[PDB]
Design a protein around this ligand. Sequence first.
Ligand SMILES: [Ca+2]
Ligand SMILES: [Ca+2]
Ligand SMILES: [Ca+2]
Ligand SMILES: [Ca+2]
Ligand SMILES: [Ca+2]
Ligand SMILES: [Ca+2]
Ligand SMILES: [Ca+2]
Ligand SMILES: [Ca+2]
Ligand SMILES: [Zn+2]
Ligand SMILES: [Zn+2]
Lengths: 316, 316
Amino acid sequence: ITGTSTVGVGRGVLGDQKNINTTYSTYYYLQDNTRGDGIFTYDAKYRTTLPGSLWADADNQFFASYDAPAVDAHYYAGVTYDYYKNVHNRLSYDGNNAAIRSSVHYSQGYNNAFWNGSEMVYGDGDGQTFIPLSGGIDVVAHELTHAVTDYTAGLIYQNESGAINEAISDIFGTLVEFYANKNPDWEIGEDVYTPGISGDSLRSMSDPAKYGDPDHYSKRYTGTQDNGGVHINSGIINKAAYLISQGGTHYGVSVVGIGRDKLGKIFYRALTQYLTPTSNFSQLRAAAVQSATDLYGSTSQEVASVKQAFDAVGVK
Amino acid sequence: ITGTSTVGVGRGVLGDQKNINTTYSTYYYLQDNTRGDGIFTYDAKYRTTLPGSLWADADNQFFASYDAPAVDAHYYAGVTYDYYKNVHNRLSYDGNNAAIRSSVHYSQGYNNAFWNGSEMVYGDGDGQTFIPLSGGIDVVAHELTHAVTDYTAGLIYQNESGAINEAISDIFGTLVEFYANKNPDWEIGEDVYTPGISGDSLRSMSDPAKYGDPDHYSKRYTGTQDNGGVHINSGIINKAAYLISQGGTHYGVSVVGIGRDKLGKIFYRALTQYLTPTSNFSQLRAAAVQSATDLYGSTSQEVASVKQAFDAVGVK
Ligand SMILES: [Ca+2]
Ligand SMILES: [Ca+2]
Ligand SMILES: [Ca+2]
Ligand SMILES: [Ca+2]
Ligand SMILES: [Ca+2]
Ligand SMILES: [Ca+2]
Ligand SMILES: [Ca+2]
Ligand SMILES: [Ca+2]
Ligand SMILES: [Zn+2]
Ligand SMILES: [Zn+2]
């Protein structure tokens, strides 16, 4: 829409109040003109037709319970755009300030959220397994990272390349959660998963085996479900990334942590300059080693820790 | 694009030559202006970013092997639009001549095709399990029918409503295959599935159990895979629709066939006037009975056969 940029106020899924960038033209729309070519949030109104209607509001105040998911989708897309811009000098997901679009209220009782190739889509959850998925900033940044991967490495969504593609989304979703300093942790989806249980999450990067995912290459899943295990075998890489950042001894292999910032720099370089659509784990290892080499020198502690981490999860 | 409407010639996935509606403006584009607001075909160029580039060609002749999938996607979207218009008086999938967009060459070795909420997407197959999926007119009409369902009943994609949603796509994909008289049968996906084996298909409507899907309500799948069995439990409804059309005795229950045309009229009425997002099998039965009642009278043979068919697959 063409109109005047302004700021409205609302409440997110978890009840927290926040300011959001809106556009005024008769109605107030969830359209942020301050980032790139814009961040636009739509109402899919419980249907599956996309993108639905650009979200319109009569008074710029978004405190209705129906508004919540749209507030967070809108807001966390802006924090993720800021992260990529400030930290990695990337403008939007294609590197040229593409507009970011998200639809909320997709379908009925839909327990998922996804980047479909053109925009973000979020279910509201059934209320038991999940609450509206846009309340989790690691979930929003995980899905928006698939858009970055699709424009850069192009990892296909199956077997080891799809596991890499999932792990990269978990790592950067976690790094964005730390960047916003929203109660950060190494878990995925804990703010929106099972409202009735405290302490759990969908997956864990610090201990993937807690929920039964592999934390070692010898335990990878080799069947056909989940497109060859793309959400399952991503634990192996998740654990490698957690070790590089935080350090630890895993199956007897000791890794000195180098921290989150270096972890984000090595993986972002690996992703944007060396990974290809069909990279597999062993080529991710070589890409991360080469990236850390480029940045810190082949005899740095940073190269050393990237090797140890991959040796500790059995990736040669 | 704005330009002059013209006609080009090409070869489809199966090697068959066909005329296609294109638009000329410097290049020749796969843009058909003769149907509704247009049918547009894009090249995703082996990536997952959508929709990719509107397909452009220098001389209006599409005989390159890379062109094949785009020729059939373009062409079979026009036959499906014609079917809905001529047979059911529906203009495009939303009933108001929405433009139909399809992208081909999605990803690498991708064994599937789908309507994503906004457009059609087709993989090229790996060459062993599938060849480019747009070569199968039942596949193209199956996916385009999900767009019709999304704008009308809105069946959610899970458990019995998602099974209904899949079966409705198989039925109308089959009816479109008969309408184009392209070697018609009651099987799904046989022109593009496993190029090395003759005689098989992904699913069968006349005998779903041939590939292990249920043909009776007592055999339905009750677990969680495939969103509660939406591709599996659709066999039950598929078999009911085949019996209503063709007749037969199934688990001892005898059904007089009333033919394809009446089958399409009853189900299209059921779909557009009585089904809701959460309809389950028993409410599909009541919807089909009511529809046949509306059209042929409560004491017709057509109502009688709809009851027998649902009794024969155990749906009360
Ligand atoms: Ca308001
Ligand atoms: Ca957290
Ligand atoms: Ca988290
Ligand atoms: Ca929980
Ligand atoms: Ca040509
Ligand atoms: Ca056929
Ligand atoms: Ca067929
Ligand atoms: Ca075959
Ligand atoms: Zn993901
Ligand atoms: Zn389907």
